[model samples]
Target: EVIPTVDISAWLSSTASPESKNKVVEEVRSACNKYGFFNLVGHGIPAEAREKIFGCTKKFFDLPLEEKMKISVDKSLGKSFRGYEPSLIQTHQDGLLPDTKECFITGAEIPADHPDAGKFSTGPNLWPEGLSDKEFRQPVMEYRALMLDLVSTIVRILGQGIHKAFGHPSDVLNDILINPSIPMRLLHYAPQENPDPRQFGVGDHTDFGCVSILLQQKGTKGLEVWYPPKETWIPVPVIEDAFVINMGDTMHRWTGGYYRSARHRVYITGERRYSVAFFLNGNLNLKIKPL
Candidate 1:
């Protein structure tokens, strides 16, 4: 029920001065110490960017069933297939005939042209060759790039926060994020049409990757989070022009007890519950160790 947020965008960026960066980093450390999740504002992402992508993804989902099934996940063996996530696949849970949820999956490797780009670059995005919606392109790409930058900023500030808290000598570790071949993409979970009355969007679980920046829809409720040591589910209230952020399990264990990944889930919303999650991850060859 206590869903407070840290506007991390305030202190993160290449253009940020030393003073403001320190202040925001300090605030981030404070928020992390107190609550593992916080709403992010001033992250420099425009509202229209998220809104437009939501509309485009919705257009993809609204396509006829036969069209969507053409690019199902089974075809690519888990690559592009960027449209319509059907029931029974939400984290492979039992009794999860989760209906009406739609998602688009994609990613980026370092562009092949750059020197050493292969070090971080992963693979290409798979789009529906059946996608005839000409309107969908511009918005989707904008959302991808915008979310990617925000992830870079969040990861960098997180590194600085860790350094400041653990007494690290410098921000050497933070530099690893530069040109990070992170997979940036969108996911749309529509209003779950339940046969029987049930829970909201998704179930209680932590993010699998490092961190996530969510561009959530307005007027769509059902997001919930369980506070640490509380064992209760509280609604994640929507803050206009803010993003909901949380730590994932990888960062949780790596930082030991310094950071905590709170248990959370997406409550099924009344209207279309469209959320774009830019999954922030690096190439596998990068050795991640316990700090």
Candidate 2:
């Protein structure tokens, strides 16, 4: 079965009736319980902002190797894991070929003087020298801010669902999200023809955070999710202007396994593919307790 498409306009609109909002919440709960993934529509992010970020992502990836390397993860990993990562640098599953993708990563922009700076994935980001902030950095950060807002809203809705199902306080989940750890990645996967069976754009694994929101390139179908009952993988379809939302390990743990963290992988074929992923994690100090 395909992942369901969820329209959250009612939840996001102030003028919507209570019944409409409740319907949206129940749809979210059902989708999470069954598939742990959904296509999010009516998210209110303008097409201009989304297109601009994708344009900036493509331009950055097209830069000369030397230019991109100027801010390589090798230099920033010591301070913060925020920079360009070359392909074959990561392997999500042991003994398999490294992921056949390169990506640029950035997260919360903690200042050097901040108490949390240089801790975990919190710190300043490294930007390529030639690209102006207006062209690349500004749009990327703007998109991230929007994702943060949307993710927070989704978390709240999920919390409401948890409250109804498990009798926990509706605000319990939101409470743990204070000072969330957010990381955004811009990824590029080149076309591969009859590649090794072990090779993947991203290997089979579950995300490590609370939730992951992804914006995929239209017409590229590489992402597949494992279906337990069928013992097979199913393709995740691309819907224009809709973001894909999935539960992560943390979410699964917090929900006491009611909500699953599905295993997924990406395999590109014949054409280049690009995607942006934003992971929303709980506060560094919060310990997850299954409800």
Candidate 3:
């Protein structure tokens, strides 16, 4: 079966009835249980904002190699892993080849005096030298804030689903979500002519965090999720104004395997592709237990 497209407008509405909200929760629960992935629509983010974010992403990647390299993840400026990562430098699984995509990573913009500042995945961001905040940072940060708000709602829905299905407390995920680790990555996959047998834009693997929200550029098709029962890979089609949402390893663990953390990979062909991914991880000190 294809991955379901869930419209969460009812849950997001202030005047939503109890039954309408329950319907949304059940759909989310069912999708998480079966596929570990779904296309989310009716999320309320404007098309203009989405377009602007993609525009910024393209602008950033279009920069000269030397300009992008100034903020390389390998350098001291990226000691916290918040900078540019060149193509073929990261391998998701040990035996698999390194990914064929270049990426830029940033997380919650923690201030210098904050207690969690400089901690893993929580610190100031690294921006390219030439781009002004208005040209790049503003749109990116605005999009990040929107994703954060949406994720908070999603996690709460997840909590309610788990509570109803598994008898866990409804608010179980709330405390952990506060000060959550939000890592955003801008990825660019170059077109391949005669690709190697072993190379992929990204190797098959499950996400490490709680949930991932992804925005794909229009007309690009590359992401595929593994179907365990069929032992095949299912291509995830792009739907206008919908964000691809997927469960991660942390959610699988938290749910005691009730929620599947499906493996996925990317393979680019014919044309270059761009995608923006937002990962929501629990707080650093929050211990996860099966609910």
Model 1: residues with Cα > 4 Å off, grouped in runs? 8-19, 77-84, 91-100, 109-122, 130-134, 169-181, 192-200
Error of 2 at 222 (Å): 0.4
Clashes found in each candidate (C-alpha, N, C closer than 3 A): 11, 0, 0
Task: Tell me the RMSD of model 2 versus the true structure.
Answer: 1.3
lDDT of 1: 0.64
- Models sorted by lDDT, best on top: 2, 3, 1
Q: Return the top candidate by TM-score.
A: 2
**Candidate 2: clashing residue pairs, number:** 0
> Which one wins by lDDT: 1 or 3?
3
lDDT of 3 by residue, 78-177 (tens): 2367889899887766666788899999888876667766677777888888999999998899999999999998999989998898788889888767
Q: Is candidate 1 or 3 superior in TM-score?
A: 3
User: Ranking by TM-score, best first?
Assistant: 2, 3, 1
Candidate-wise lDDT, in order? 0.64, 0.88, 0.88
Return the TM-score for candidate 1, rounded to 2 decimals.
0.82
Tens digit per residue, CA lDDT, model 2, 165-190: 98888887896568789999999998
Tens digits of per-residue lDDT, candidate 1, 1-291, equal: 476666555475578788877887777666655567778888776766766777777777777767767766555432333334554456435655453345666555334354443232244444666655467765667677777777777777777877887766445345436545455445566553553434335666777667777767787776777775666777777889988877777677767646667777775644666777776654355566767
